[PDB]
Coordinates of N, CA and C and ligand atoms in Angstrom, one line a residue:
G7 N 104.7 131.0 68.4 CA 104.1 131.6 69.1 C 103.7 130.6 70.4
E8 N 102.5 130.1 70.5 CA 102.4 129.1 71.9 C 101.6 127.9 71.5
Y9 N 100.5 127.9 70.7 CA 99.7 127.0 70.1 C 100.7 126.3 69.0
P10 N 100.6 125.2 69.3 CA 101.5 124.2 68.0 C 101.0 124.5 66.5
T11 N 102.0 124.3 65.8 CA 101.4 124.5 64.2 C 102.3 123.8 63.6
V12 N 102.2 123.4 61.8 CA 102.7 122.3 61.3 C 104.2 122.5 61.5
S13 N 104.7 123.6 61.5 CA 106.2 123.8 61.2 C 106.9 123.2 62.3
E14 N 106.2 123.4 63.7 CA 106.8 122.6 64.6 C 106.4 121.2 65.0
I15 N 105.7 120.3 64.1 CA 105.5 119.1 64.4 C 105.8 117.9 63.1
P16 N 106.8 117.3 63.2 CA 106.9 116.4 62.1 C 105.9 115.5 61.9
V17 N 105.2 115.1 60.9 CA 104.4 113.9 60.7 C 105.1 112.5 61.7
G18 N 104.0 112.0 62.5 CA 104.2 111.2 63.6 C 104.6 111.6 65.0
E19 N 104.8 112.9 65.3 CA 104.9 113.2 66.6 C 103.5 114.0 66.8
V20 N 103.3 113.8 68.2 CA 101.9 114.5 68.6 C 102.4 115.5 70.1
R21 N 101.8 116.5 69.8 CA 101.6 117.6 71.1 C 100.6 117.7 72.1
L22 N 100.6 118.0 73.1 CA 99.2 118.4 73.7 C 99.3 119.8 74.2
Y23 N 98.2 120.3 74.4 CA 98.2 121.6 74.8 C 97.1 121.8 75.8
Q24 N 97.4 122.5 76.9 CA 96.4 122.5 78.3 C 95.6 123.9 78.0
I25 N 94.2 123.2 77.4 CA 93.2 124.8 77.5 C 92.8 125.0 78.7
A26 N 92.4 124.2 80.0 CA 92.0 124.5 81.1 C 92.0 123.3 81.8
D27 N 92.0 123.7 83.3 CA 91.9 122.7 84.0 C 91.1 121.0 83.7
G28 N 92.0 120.0 83.5 CA 91.4 119.0 83.0 C 91.1 118.9 81.4
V29 N 91.6 119.7 80.9 CA 90.9 119.4 79.1 C 92.3 120.2 78.8
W30 N 92.9 119.1 77.6 CA 93.7 119.3 76.6 C 93.3 119.1 75.1
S31 N 94.2 119.9 74.2 CA 94.0 119.5 73.2 C 95.1 118.5 73.0
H32 N 94.8 117.8 71.4 CA 96.2 116.9 70.9 C 96.2 117.5 69.6
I33 N 97.3 117.8 69.2 CA 97.8 118.1 67.9 C 98.6 117.4 67.3
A34 N 98.5 116.9 66.2 CA 99.2 116.0 65.2 C 99.3 116.6 63.9
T35 N 100.0 115.9 63.0 CA 99.7 116.5 61.6 C 100.0 115.2 60.4
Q36 N 99.8 115.3 59.5 CA 99.5 114.5 58.3 C 99.5 114.9 56.9
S37 N 99.9 114.2 56.2 CA 100.0 114.4 54.8 C 98.5 114.5 54.2
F38 N 98.2 115.2 53.0 CA 97.0 114.9 52.7 C 97.1 115.9 51.2
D39 N 97.0 115.0 49.9 CA 96.9 115.6 49.0 C 98.1 116.6 48.6
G40 N 99.4 116.3 49.1 CA 100.4 116.8 48.7 C 100.8 118.0 49.7
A41 N 99.9 118.0 50.8 CA 100.5 119.4 51.6 C 100.4 118.4 53.1
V42 N 100.7 119.2 54.0 CA 100.9 118.7 55.5 C 99.6 119.8 56.2
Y43 N 98.9 119.0 57.0 CA 97.8 119.4 57.5 C 98.0 119.4 59.4
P44 N 97.8 120.3 60.1 CA 97.6 120.0 61.5 C 96.0 119.5 61.6
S45 N 95.9 118.7 63.2 CA 94.8 118.1 63.3 C 94.7 118.5 64.9
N46 N 93.3 118.9 65.5 CA 93.1 118.6 66.7 C 92.1 117.7 67.2
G47 N 92.3 117.0 68.5 CA 91.4 116.2 69.2 C 91.3 116.8 70.8
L48 N 90.7 116.0 71.4 CA 90.7 116.7 72.8 C 90.7 115.7 73.7
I49 N 91.2 115.9 75.1 CA 91.2 114.9 76.2 C 90.9 115.5 77.4
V50 N 89.7 115.0 78.1 CA 89.0 115.5 79.1 C 89.2 114.7 80.0
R51 N 90.0 115.1 81.6 CA 89.9 114.1 82.5 C 88.6 113.9 83.3
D52 N 88.2 112.8 83.7 CA 87.0 111.8 83.6 C 87.2 111.1 85.0
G53 N 87.4 111.8 86.3 CA 87.6 111.3 87.6 C 89.2 110.7 87.3
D54 N 89.6 109.6 87.6 CA 90.7 109.3 87.6 C 91.4 108.6 86.3
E55 N 90.2 108.6 85.4 CA 90.6 108.2 83.9 C 90.4 109.5 82.9
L56 N 90.8 109.0 81.5 CA 90.4 110.1 80.7 C 89.7 109.8 79.3
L57 N 88.8 110.5 79.0 CA 88.2 110.4 77.9 C 88.8 111.2 76.7
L58 N 88.7 110.5 75.7 CA 89.5 110.9 74.5 C 88.5 111.2 73.5
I59 N 88.7 112.6 72.8 CA 87.9 112.9 71.7 C 88.7 112.9 70.3
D60 N 88.3 112.1 69.4 CA 88.9 111.8 68.3 C 90.4 111.2 68.3
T61 N 90.8 110.6 67.0 CA 92.2 110.2 67.1 C 93.2 111.1 66.6
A62 N 94.5 110.8 66.5 CA 95.4 111.6 65.8 C 95.7 111.7 64.4
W63 N 94.6 111.0 63.7 CA 94.8 111.0 62.2 C 95.9 109.8 61.8
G64 N 95.9 108.4 62.0 CA 96.3 107.5 61.5 C 96.9 106.7 62.8
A65 N 97.1 105.4 62.5 CA 97.5 104.4 63.6 C 99.0 104.7 64.3
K66 N 99.9 105.3 63.5 CA 101.5 106.0 63.8 C 101.0 107.1 64.8
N67 N 100.4 108.0 64.4 CA 99.9 109.1 65.3 C 99.3 108.8 66.7
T68 N 98.4 108.1 66.3 CA 97.6 107.5 67.6 C 98.5 106.8 68.6
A69 N 99.3 106.0 68.1 CA 100.1 105.5 69.1 C 100.9 106.7 69.7
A70 N 101.5 107.2 68.9 CA 102.3 108.3 69.6 C 101.5 109.1 70.4
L71 N 100.3 109.2 70.2 CA 99.3 110.2 71.2 C 99.2 109.6 72.6
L72 N 98.8 107.8 72.5 CA 98.7 107.6 73.8 C 100.1 107.6 74.7
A73 N 101.1 107.5 73.9 CA 102.5 107.6 74.5 C 102.7 108.9 75.2
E74 N 102.5 110.0 74.2 CA 102.3 111.2 75.1 C 101.5 111.7 76.1
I75 N 100.2 111.0 76.2 CA 99.3 111.1 77.2 C 99.8 110.5 78.3
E76 N 100.5 109.2 78.3 CA 101.1 108.7 79.5 C 102.2 109.2 80.0
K77 N 103.1 109.9 79.2 CA 104.1 110.7 79.6 C 103.8 111.8 80.7
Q78 N 102.9 112.4 79.9 CA 102.6 113.8 80.4 C 101.4 114.0 81.4
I79 N 100.4 113.1 81.2 CA 99.3 112.9 82.5 C 99.4 111.8 83.0
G80 N 99.5 110.5 82.3 CA 99.8 109.4 83.4 C 98.5 108.7 83.9
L81 N 97.1 109.0 83.4 CA 96.0 108.6 83.6 C 95.7 107.8 82.5
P82 N 94.9 106.7 82.7 CA 94.3 105.7 81.6 C 93.3 106.4 80.7
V83 N 93.5 106.2 79.6 CA 92.3 106.6 78.6 C 91.3 105.4 78.6
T84 N 90.1 105.5 78.8 CA 89.0 104.4 79.2 C 88.5 104.4 77.8
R85 N 87.7 105.5 77.4 CA 86.8 105.5 76.4 C 87.2 106.7 75.5
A86 N 86.8 106.6 74.0 CA 87.1 107.6 73.0 C 85.9 107.6 72.3
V87 N 85.6 108.8 71.9 CA 84.4 109.3 70.8 C 84.9 109.9 70.0
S88 N 84.7 109.4 68.6 CA 85.2 110.1 67.2 C 83.8 110.7 66.7
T89 N 84.3 112.2 66.4 CA 83.2 113.1 66.0 C 82.7 112.9 64.6
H90 N 83.3 112.4 64.0 CA 82.7 111.9 62.4 C 83.5 111.3 61.7
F91 N 82.8 110.4 60.7 CA 83.6 109.2 59.9 C 84.9 109.1 59.3
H92 N 85.3 110.4 59.1 CA 86.8 110.5 58.5 C 88.3 110.0 59.2
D93 N 89.2 110.1 58.6 CA 90.4 109.4 58.8 C 90.8 110.6 60.0
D94 N 90.9 111.6 59.9 CA 91.4 112.2 61.2 C 90.6 112.0 62.4
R95 N 89.6 111.4 62.5 CA 88.6 111.4 63.6 C 88.2 109.6 63.9
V96 N 88.7 108.7 63.1 CA 88.6 107.5 63.2 C 89.7 106.8 62.8
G97 N 90.7 107.3 62.1 CA 92.2 106.8 62.0 C 93.0 106.4 63.1
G98 N 93.0 105.4 63.5 CA 93.5 105.0 64.6 C 92.9 104.2 65.8
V99 N 91.4 104.1 65.5 CA 90.3 103.3 66.4 C 90.9 102.0 66.8
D100 N 91.9 101.6 65.8 CA 92.3 100.0 66.1 C 93.2 100.1 67.0
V101 N 94.0 100.9 66.9 CA 95.3 101.1 68.0 C 94.8 101.4 69.4
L102 N 93.6 102.1 69.3 CA 92.9 102.7 70.9 C 92.4 101.2 71.5
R103 N 91.8 100.5 70.4 CA 91.1 99.4 70.6 C 92.0 98.1 71.3
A104 N 93.2 98.2 70.7 CA 94.2 97.2 71.1 C 94.8 97.7 72.2
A105 N 94.8 98.9 72.7 CA 95.2 99.7 74.1 C 94.2 99.6 75.1
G106 N 93.2 98.9 74.7 CA 92.1 98.9 75.8 C 91.2 99.7 76.0
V107 N 90.8 100.9 75.2 CA 90.0 102.0 75.1 C 88.8 101.6 74.3
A108 N 87.5 101.9 75.2 CA 86.1 101.5 74.5 C 86.0 102.5 73.6
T109 N 85.8 102.5 72.2 CA 86.0 103.4 71.4 C 84.2 103.2 70.8
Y110 N 83.8 104.7 70.7 CA 82.5 105.2 70.4 C 82.1 105.9 69.6
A111 N 81.1 105.9 68.8 CA 80.7 106.9 67.7 C 79.4 106.6 67.6
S112 N 78.4 107.5 66.7 CA 77.1 107.4 66.7 C 76.7 106.5 65.7
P113 N 75.5 105.8 65.6 CA 75.2 104.9 64.6 C 75.5 105.5 63.3
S114 N 75.2 106.9 63.0 CA 75.3 107.4 61.8 C 76.7 107.2 61.5
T115 N 78.0 108.0 62.2 CA 79.0 107.6 62.2 C 79.6 106.0 61.7
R116 N 79.0 105.2 62.4 CA 79.4 103.6 62.2 C 79.2 103.3 61.0
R117 N 77.6 103.7 60.3 CA 77.4 103.5 59.1 C 78.1 104.1 58.0
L118 N 78.4 105.3 58.2 CA 79.2 106.1 57.4 C 80.9 105.5 57.1
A119 N 81.3 104.9 58.2 CA 82.7 104.7 58.3 C 82.8 103.3 57.9
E120 N 81.7 102.3 57.7 CA 81.9 101.5 57.0 C 81.8 101.2 55.6
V121 N 80.7 102.0 55.1 CA 80.6 102.5 53.9 C 81.8 102.6 53.1
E122 N 82.6 103.8 53.6 CA 83.7 104.4 52.9 C 84.8 103.4 53.3
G123 N 84.8 102.4 54.4 CA 86.0 101.5 54.4 C 86.9 102.4 55.4
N124 N 86.6 102.9 56.4 CA 87.4 103.6 57.6 C 87.1 102.7 58.6
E125 N 87.9 102.9 59.7 CA 87.9 102.4 60.9 C 86.6 102.4 61.7
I126 N 85.9 101.5 62.5 CA 84.7 101.8 62.8 C 84.7 101.7 64.3
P127 N 84.2 102.6 65.1 CA 84.3 102.3 66.7 C 83.2 101.4 66.8
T128 N 83.7 100.8 68.2 CA 82.7 99.4 68.5 C 81.4 100.0 69.1
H129 N 81.6 101.1 70.0 CA 80.4 101.1 70.7 C 79.4 102.4 70.0
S130 N 78.0 102.1 70.7 CA 77.1 103.3 69.8 C 76.7 104.1 70.7
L131 N 76.6 105.5 70.3 CA 76.2 106.5 71.1 C 74.7 107.0 70.5
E132 N 73.7 106.6 71.4 CA 72.6 106.7 70.9 C 71.7 108.0 71.4
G133 N 70.8 108.5 70.8 CA 70.2 109.6 71.0 C 70.7 110.9 70.4
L134 N 71.3 110.7 69.1 CA 72.1 111.9 68.5 C 71.4 111.9 67.0
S135 N 70.4 111.2 66.6 CA 70.4 111.1 65.3 C 69.5 112.5 64.7
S136 N 69.0 113.2 65.2 CA 68.1 114.3 65.2 C 68.9 115.5 65.3
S137 N 68.8 116.5 64.6 CA 69.6 117.7 64.8 C 69.0 118.6 66.0
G138 N 70.0 119.0 66.7 CA 69.6 119.5 68.2 C 69.6 118.8 69.2
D139 N 69.6 117.6 68.9 CA 69.8 116.3 70.1 C 71.1 116.6 70.9
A140 N 71.1 116.2 72.3 CA 72.3 116.2 72.9 C 71.9 115.4 73.9
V141 N 73.3 114.6 74.4 CA 73.3 113.4 75.3 C 74.6 113.9 75.8
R142 N 74.5 113.4 77.5 CA 75.4 113.5 78.6 C 76.4 112.1 78.0
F143 N 77.8 112.5 78.1 CA 78.7 111.3 78.3 C 80.0 111.6 79.1
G144 N 79.6 111.2 80.5 CA 80.7 111.9 81.7 C 80.8 113.1 81.4
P145 N 82.1 113.6 81.5 CA 82.4 114.8 81.6 C 82.2 116.0 80.6
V146 N 81.6 115.4 79.4 CA 81.1 116.4 78.6 C 79.9 116.0 78.0
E147 N 79.3 116.9 76.9 CA 78.0 116.7 76.6 C 78.2 116.7 74.8
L148 N 77.6 115.6 74.3 CA 77.6 115.6 73.0 C 76.4 116.1 72.3
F149 N 76.7 116.7 71.2 CA 75.7 117.5 70.2 C 75.4 117.6 68.9
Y150 N 74.4 116.9 68.3 CA 74.5 116.8 67.1 C 74.1 117.9 66.5
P151 N 74.5 118.7 65.8 CA 74.0 120.4 65.5 C 73.4 120.1 64.0
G152 N 73.3 118.9 63.3 CA 72.6 118.9 61.9 C 73.8 118.7 61.1
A153 N 73.7 118.4 59.9 CA 74.6 118.0 58.7 C 75.5 119.7 58.5
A154 N 76.6 119.4 58.3 CA 78.0 120.5 58.1 C 78.8 120.3 57.3
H155 N 80.2 119.9 57.9 CA 81.3 119.3 57.7 C 81.1 118.1 56.9
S156 N 80.2 117.2 57.6 CA 79.7 115.9 57.2 C 78.3 116.0 57.8
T157 N 77.7 114.6 57.3 CA 76.3 114.6 57.7 C 76.0 114.2 59.3
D158 N 77.2 113.4 60.0 CA 77.3 112.8 61.0 C 78.1 113.8 61.9
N159 N 78.5 114.7 61.7 CA 79.6 115.6 62.7 C 78.9 115.9 64.1
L160 N 79.4 115.7 64.9 CA 79.1 115.9 66.5 C 80.2 117.0 67.0
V161 N 79.6 117.7 67.9 CA 80.7 118.5 68.7 C 80.2 118.3 69.9
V162 N 81.4 118.6 70.9 CA 81.7 118.0 72.0 C 81.6 119.3 73.2
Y163 N 81.3 119.3 74.3 CA 81.3 120.4 75.2 C 81.5 120.0 76.7
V164 N 82.6 120.8 77.1 CA 82.8 120.4 78.5 C 82.4 121.3 79.5
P165 N 81.4 121.3 80.4 CA 80.8 122.1 81.1 C 81.5 122.9 82.0
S166 N 82.3 122.1 82.8 CA 83.3 122.6 83.9 C 84.3 123.7 83.5
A167 N 84.5 123.6 82.1 CA 85.5 124.5 81.3 C 85.0 125.6 80.4
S168 N 84.0 125.3 80.3 CA 83.4 126.0 78.9 C 84.2 125.9 77.6
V169 N 84.8 124.7 77.4 CA 85.3 124.4 76.1 C 84.3 123.8 75.1
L170 N 84.1 124.3 73.9 CA 83.4 123.6 72.8 C 84.6 123.3 71.9
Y171 N 84.5 121.9 71.5 CA 85.0 121.4 70.5 C 84.2 121.1 69.4
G172 N 84.6 122.0 68.2 CA 83.6 122.2 67.2 C 84.4 121.1 66.2
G173 N 85.3 120.4 66.2 CA 85.6 119.3 65.2 C 85.6 120.2 63.6
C174 N 85.3 119.4 62.8 CA 85.8 119.8 61.5 C 84.5 120.6 60.9
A175 N 83.4 120.9 61.5 CA 82.4 121.8 61.2 C 82.8 123.0 61.5
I176 N 83.9 123.6 62.6 CA 84.2 124.8 62.8 C 85.7 124.8 62.3
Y177 N 85.7 126.0 61.5 CA 87.3 126.5 61.0 C 87.9 127.4 61.9
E178 N 89.2 127.5 61.8 CA 90.1 128.5 62.4 C 89.9 129.7 61.7
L179 N 90.2 130.8 62.3 CA 90.1 132.1 61.8 C 90.9 132.6 60.5
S180 N 92.0 131.9 60.8 CA 93.2 132.0 59.5 C 92.9 131.3 58.2
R181 N 91.9 130.4 58.3 CA 91.3 129.6 57.2 C 90.0 130.6 56.5
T182 N 90.5 130.9 55.4 CA 89.6 131.8 54.5 C 88.9 131.2 53.3
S183 N 89.5 130.0 53.1 CA 88.7 129.3 51.9 C 88.5 127.6 52.6
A184 N 87.4 127.2 51.9 CA 86.9 126.2 52.2 C 88.0 124.9 52.6
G185 N 87.9 124.2 53.4 CA 89.0 122.8 53.9 C 88.2 122.0 52.7
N186 N 88.5 120.5 53.3 CA 87.8 119.8 52.4 C 86.2 119.5 52.9
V187 N 85.3 119.7 51.6 CA 84.1 119.7 51.6 C 83.3 118.6 50.7
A188 N 84.1 117.5 50.5 CA 83.7 116.4 49.6 C 82.1 115.8 50.2
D189 N 82.0 115.7 51.3 CA 80.9 115.1 52.0 C 80.1 115.8 52.8
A190 N 80.4 117.3 52.6 CA 79.8 118.3 53.4 C 78.3 118.5 52.8
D191 N 77.6 119.2 53.4 CA 76.4 119.7 53.4 C 76.0 121.2 53.2
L192 N 76.7 121.8 52.4 CA 76.9 123.1 52.2 C 75.7 123.8 52.4
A193 N 74.3 123.5 51.9 CA 73.1 124.1 52.1 C 72.6 124.2 53.7
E194 N 73.1 123.3 54.4 CA 72.6 123.2 55.9 C 73.7 123.8 56.7
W195 N 74.9 123.7 56.4 CA 76.3 124.0 57.2 C 75.9 125.3 58.3
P196 N 75.6 126.4 57.5 CA 75.2 127.6 58.4 C 73.9 127.5 59.5
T197 N 73.1 126.8 59.1 CA 72.0 126.5 59.8 C 72.4 125.5 61.0
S198 N 73.4 124.5 60.9 CA 73.9 123.7 61.6 C 74.8 124.4 62.7
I199 N 75.4 125.5 62.3 CA 76.6 126.5 63.0 C 75.5 127.2 63.9
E200 N 74.5 127.7 63.5 CA 73.7 128.4 64.5 C 73.2 127.6 65.4
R201 N 72.8 126.4 65.1 CA 72.2 125.7 66.4 C 73.1 125.5 67.4
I202 N 74.8 125.5 67.0 CA 75.7 125.4 67.8 C 75.7 126.9 68.8
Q203 N 75.4 127.8 68.2 CA 75.3 129.1 69.0 C 74.4 128.9 70.0
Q204 N 73.3 128.7 69.5 CA 71.9 128.9 70.3 C 72.0 127.7 71.6
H205 N 72.9 126.7 71.4 CA 73.0 125.6 72.6 C 74.0 125.9 73.6
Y206 N 75.4 126.6 73.0 CA 76.3 126.7 73.6 C 76.8 128.4 73.9
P207 N 75.9 129.2 74.1 CA 76.3 130.5 74.0 C 77.3 130.9 75.1
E208 N 77.6 130.2 76.2 CA 78.4 130.2 77.1 C 79.8 130.1 77.0
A209 N 79.9 129.1 75.6 CA 81.3 128.7 75.4 C 82.4 130.0 75.4
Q210 N 83.5 129.5 76.5 CA 84.6 130.6 76.0 C 85.8 130.2 75.3
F211 N 85.9 128.8 75.0 CA 87.1 128.4 74.2 C 86.4 127.6 73.1
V212 N 86.9 127.9 71.9 CA 86.1 127.0 71.0 C 87.4 126.4 70.1
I213 N 87.5 124.9 69.8 CA 88.6 124.4 69.3 C 88.1 123.6 67.8
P214 N 88.6 124.2 66.8 CA 88.2 123.8 65.2 C 89.1 122.3 65.3
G215 N 88.4 121.8 64.4 CA 89.1 120.3 63.8 C 90.6 120.3 63.5
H216 N 91.0 121.8 62.9 CA 92.3 121.8 62.4 C 92.5 123.7 62.7
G217 N 94.0 123.9 63.4 CA 94.1 124.9 63.5 C 94.0 125.7 65.0
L218 N 93.9 126.7 65.1 CA 94.4 127.4 66.2 C 93.0 127.9 67.0
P219 N 92.8 127.4 68.3 CA 91.7 127.7 69.0 C 91.2 129.2 69.1
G220 N 89.9 129.5 69.2 CA 89.6 130.7 69.6 C 88.2 131.0 70.5
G221 N 87.2 131.9 70.3 CA 86.2 131.7 71.0 C 84.8 131.5 70.2
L222 N 83.7 132.0 70.3 CA 82.6 131.8 69.5 C 82.4 132.5 68.3
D223 N 83.3 133.5 68.1 CA 83.5 134.0 66.9 C 84.1 133.2 65.8
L224 N 84.9 132.0 66.0 CA 84.9 131.0 65.1 C 83.3 130.3 64.0
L225 N 82.5 130.7 65.0 CA 81.4 130.3 64.3 C 80.8 131.2 63.1
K226 N 80.9 132.4 63.2 CA 80.1 133.4 62.4 C 81.2 133.3 61.0
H227 N 82.5 133.0 61.5 CA 83.7 133.0 60.8 C 83.5 131.9 59.6
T228 N 83.1 130.7 60.1 CA 83.2 129.5 59.4 C 81.6 129.6 58.8
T229 N 80.8 130.2 58.8 CA 79.6 130.4 58.0 C 80.0 131.6 56.9
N230 N 80.8 132.3 57.3 CA 81.3 133.4 56.1 C 81.8 132.9 55.2
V231 N 83.0 131.8 55.6 CA 83.8 131.0 54.4 C 83.0 130.2 53.8
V232 N 82.0 129.3 54.4 CA 81.4 128.5 53.6 C 80.1 129.0 52.6
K233 N 79.8 130.2 53.3 CA 78.8 130.8 52.2 C 79.6 131.2 51.1
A234 N 80.8 131.8 51.1 CA 81.6 132.1 50.1 C 81.8 131.0 49.1
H235 N 82.1 129.6 49.8 CA 82.5 128.6 48.8 C 81.2 128.1 48.4
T236 N 80.2 128.3 48.8 CA 78.8 128.1 48.4 C 78.7 128.8 47.0
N237 N 79.1 129.9 47.1 CA 79.0 130.9 45.9 C 80.1 131.0 44.7
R238 N 80.8 130.0 45.0 CA 82.0 129.8 44.1 C 81.6 130.0 42.5
Ligands
KDZ301 O1 88.6 119.3 58.0 C1 88.8 119.8 56.6 O2 88.5 120.4 56.2 C2 90.2 118.9 56.1 C3 91.0 119.1 55.2 C4 92.0 118.6 54.6 C5 92.2 117.0 55.1 C6 91.2 116.7 55.7 C7 90.1 117.3 56.4 O3 89.3 116.8 57.4 B1 88.3 115.6 56.8 O4 87.7 115.1 58.1 O5 87.5 116.0 55.8 C8 89.7 114.5 56.3 S1 89.7 114.3 54.3 C9 88.0 113.4 54.1 C10 87.7 112.7 52.7 C11 88.9 112.0 52.2 C12 88.7 111.6 50.9 C13 87.6 111.9 50.0 C14 86.6 112.3 50.7 C15 86.8 112.8 52.3 C16 91.0 115.0 56.4
CL302 CL1 82.8 98.9 77.6
CL303 CL1 84.5 136.4 58.9
ZN304 ZN1 85.9 115.1 57.6
ZN305 ZN1 83.0 97.9 75.6
ZN306 ZN1 88.9 117.6 59.0

């Protein structure tokens, strides 16, 4: 097709995909419980610098990510935001820090990462602890929709491009059964998704944490999958 998939990406390689002017996704792959999964993050041009959303799921992949950014874009990554505390979002933070990137997460994410033993972004994102909270972070808005995939999950909106990055709280359309839900709040996840719809109804591109981008139709789709799992 056009968007990169697992079959195209050996573990250890990273692809970039331009979504809109000054907005890319990054796509990596990783082994998990006997299978290989793709995983997305985001890159947003921030003047003559770059803002990174999420690691590429591990130190080796994140080093490859920084090299691909330098090759293909050539602007410095100065800040990064991790959208929750799991390894596909913070695994590789130490590589970012060693490369001079100022790494950020909410206090909720930093607390959960510490308890779990995952890498801990250094700087705090305040103003996001209550469902419905939004704060500006340069060329993006950060939004805490409520507990969903995890209790700390954030979504990221790029207003200049109408790109909504949903992270692991939003599933791609071809996913028809739940992904990893060990730390999820199944009871609240649909309510949290509806908060995203109410806050970003103008979004034109919606990027899931794993798999193919689409539009806002990914939201009701995710709710339908989560409700089906709830009823297992
Ligand atoms: O997003 C998904 O659904 C997804 C699916 C497969 C692997 C992964 C996924 O994302 B994540 O952030 O949960 C992570 S596993 C997080 C975890 C691991 C072990 C014990 C508890 C929690 C990587
Ligand atoms: Cl700083
Ligand atoms: Cl559906
Ligand atoms: Zn997760
Ligand atoms: Zn700093
Ligand atoms: Zn995930």
